Every structure is written in C-alpha cells, then in structure tokens.
Amino acid sequence: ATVLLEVPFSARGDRIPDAVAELRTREPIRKVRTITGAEAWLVSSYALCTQVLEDRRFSMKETAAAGAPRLNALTVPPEVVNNMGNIADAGLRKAVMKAITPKAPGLEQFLRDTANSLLDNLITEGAPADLRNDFADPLATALHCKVLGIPQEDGPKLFRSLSIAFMSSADPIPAAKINWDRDIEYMAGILENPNITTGLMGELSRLRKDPAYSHVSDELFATIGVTFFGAGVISTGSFLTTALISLIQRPQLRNLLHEKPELIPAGVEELLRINLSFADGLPRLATADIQVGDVLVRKGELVLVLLEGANFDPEHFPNPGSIELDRPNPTSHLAFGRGQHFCPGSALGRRHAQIGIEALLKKMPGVDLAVPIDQLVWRTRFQRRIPERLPVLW
Ligand code: HEM
Ligand SMILES: O=C1N[C@@H](Cc2ccc(O)c(O)c2)C(=O)N[C@H]1Cc1ccc(O)cc1
C-alpha cells in the first residue's frame, strides 16, 4: 500500500518534475495531501488553473477561516490574508498602485546604478561571487526601500525577517510573530517620522492625516508597508535569482541577450513563464460546490493552483520547456497570477529583473556557475524555491 500523493513534489527550482506533466495529462485536477495533513485539490492544466483563479467563489480570504483544510500555517494575522481587499475597502488601491510603478522619476536610474555598484563590488572582490546574497537580494531590498521611501540602511534588518516570514510550515512559527510585530512597530514609527515624505510610506503618511481617510486604521497603514516590502522583496529577489540560473544554463540565450539587449524584455517574459520560484500552488477555499473538470469541488475544500502546471502546459505553450522569444501569447502565463488577485507589483517585478539582467550581462558577459548545478542547496519548507547561495565565476 501507498499513501496519498503529497505536495510539494520538490524544492529544486532548476528542473520541473516529470510528475507535473503526468498529472496534467492524466488527472489535471486530483487529490493530494499537504504538509499539514489536510487533503486538497491540485490543479495543473492551464485551462483549469485559469478557471479557478477567475472564479471569485474560490476565495483567498476564506483560506484563513478557522477549521479549514490548510496548505500551511499562517505567518501573518488572519485579517492580512484579506490584505488587498482591506486596501481596496480603505480607498487606498489607486494610491498604492501609483507608488509601486517602475515609471516613477529616477527609479529606473536608481535600479541601474544600484545593480552596477553591486556588480562592481563583486568584480573587485574577485570570483567566486554569490549572485543571490550579494546581487539579487540586495538589489530587491534597495529597490523596495526606495519605492517605500524608507532609509536604505533599514533594509537589511527588514530583509532578515523574510527567511521566516515566507516559510511554508505545517505549524505556527513563534519567530514569525516576533518579527511581524517588530516590523509593524517600525512601519508605525515611519508614519510618525516627519522625514518620510517620499514613496509609498510618504504618500500613506499624508493620506493618514487627510480627512477623507480619518477612519482608516493605523494598523492597516503599517501593514501595507510590511506586506509590500515583504512580498515584493521575496518575490523579486527569488525570481531574479532563479531566472539567473535559467539564463546561465542557456548560454546561447545568454549570448543573444548580451548581443541584443533590446530582446531582454521578451527574454524576461519567457524567464517568468518557465520560473519555478513559487514552491506551492496558489491556495483558494471553495465557498460553493463548483465543477472543475471531472471533479465537483465541495464548499469548504482547499484548491491549489499549480503555476508551473499552467505555464508548462503544451496545449497553451507548445514546446513549453524551451525559451522562445517570438511566441504569439507571451504575457499569457500565470507567473503573476490571474483574476482578482493578479500581482499589483507586476510592472516593478518585470523592470527589476530586466535591469538586473541587463547590468549583469554588460559587466559579466562570461558569467557561469562556479559549482556543478547539483551542488546548489535548495531551501525547503518555504513559499519560494531558491538556492541558499548562487556561486558564479565570469
Ligand atoms: C517577479 C516578481 C513577482 C512575482 C513573480 C510575483 C507573483 C505574484 C503572484 C503569483 C501573485 C498572486 C497570488 C495569488 O493569487 O494567491 C502575487 C500577488 C501579490 N504580489 Fe506579487 N509578485 C512579484 C512582485 C511583486 C512586487 C514587486 C510586489 C510589491 C511591491 C508584489 C506584491 C504582491 C501582493 C501584495 C500581492 C497580493 C495581491 C492580491 O491578493 O490581490 N509582488 N504576486
Ligand atoms: O496572506 C497574505 N499576505 C500578504 C503577503 C505577505 C506579506 C508579508 C508576509 O510576511 C507574508 O507571509 C505574506 C498579502 O498581501 N496578501 C495575502 C495573500 C498573499 C499571500 C502570499 C503572497 O506571496 C501574496 C499574497
């Protein structure tokens, strides 16, 4: 006898398991067991993943309901599982979007200058260099301090909460609450700090004192700062790191992007499509009985939308494992989700990766792994797939 198939399949972010194509072909919606012991429906075809993400009756907020089957333990207060809904209800959605666009004056120049300075430092130190800890993650942290309007010197400590805040654990994490409460206290102090007048926190600080937002809670204003720093830094740092592995393993593509940097945006869109940075399916709780393919999902059940199931589906993306810069449907992947919860930071995430890759290819055109690829250490029981160190030479 065997136990029910368990998720996730592998923490490795450099290869897709053969199991994904097997499930997609044979049972694109099927039952699995998560790390908490709950059962869930794993959805792995592009058609069914889109159907779940576009039907609001599959709710993100309701995954925090007491007694629900869980993917993992919460690392935030349950009301934060409704974060974007709370922001929208507060009338803050437009202001938050405007503050996180990469089009802000001098932001792209700041990204280029920061990437170039980090790379010059690595070149001075000499090979091997760690592209995660000494490139992708500090570039993400510096970008988010600038977008938030907070001091660059405060970034590293806020960043150190993330190895715990984005864990995918069977059980509650005592350290996640200690860091959450401290990071909220920091952002509450930022709202009260007269020197913070730019970026997202400068704008929220002004709206907080505007009569049209007098009843928005101080809890929400501080929560927006913690959550946008955390989700943005973990997502951009982890995507850039794993996209750099995808590129280093494709020297013909690396050479083409070095020669024709105008192709970098199309290259980043394909690097997003084949990305394995999300370690778990996106979770939703059914709020009604809903037919999904051959399964009638019942009210109260957990559904997991496997992004790589959709993004490597050959019925939507022919020769899915190949980076092809001339696809006719290039942005139709699900790397930023779909529907109500579509990533609000998509343009910023695209720009961070494009500028990071452009700077790396200019400075280190001969970039290559300095260790055999199997020697990368993949972080386990985490919401992202990332190597602990990314050692390169050039
Ligand atoms: C390469 C970069 C990024 C990737 C791949 C990424 C991916 C995603 C995905 C797949 C979702 C949907 C989650 C779901 O439906 O359950 C999402 C949501 C979100 N992302 Fe991003 N993200 C990235 C960058 C960012 C940045 C830069 C920020 C903010 C500065 C951000 C903030 C958020 C937030 C707050 C949500 C929740 C939205 C909602 O629930 O409506 N993301 N992201
Ligand atoms: O539960 C949520 N949390 C936050 C994202 C977030 C920010 C900081 C953290 O320490 C964390 O673990 C998760 C949110 O905006 N919306 C919801 C849904 C969500 C979860 C994860 C994610 O990557 C994006 C959104």
From Swiss-Prot:
It is an enzyme of class 1 (oxidoreductase). Catalyzes C-C bond formation between the carbons ortho to the phenolic hydroxyl of cyclo(L-tyr-L-tyr) (cYY) producing mycocyclosin. Can also use cyclo(L-Tyr-L-Phe) (cYF), cyclo(L-Tyr-L-Trp) (cYW) and cyclo(L-Tyr-L-3,4-dihydroxyphenylalanine) (cY-DOPA) as substrate. It catalyses: cyclo(L-tyrosyl-L-tyrosyl) + 2 reduced [2Fe-2S]-[ferredoxin] + O2 + 2 H(+) = mycoclysin + 2 oxidized [2Fe-2S]-[ferredoxin] + 2 H2O. The keyword Metal-binding applies. Its EC number is 1.14.19.70. The keyword Nucleotide-binding does not apply. Transmembrane segments: none annotated. Belongs to the cytochrome P450 family. This is Mycocyclosin synthase. GO terms for cellular component: cytoplasm. Pfam families: p450. Heme binds at residues 284, 341, 343. Substrate binds at residues 75, 83-84, 235, 299, 383. Its cofactor is heme.
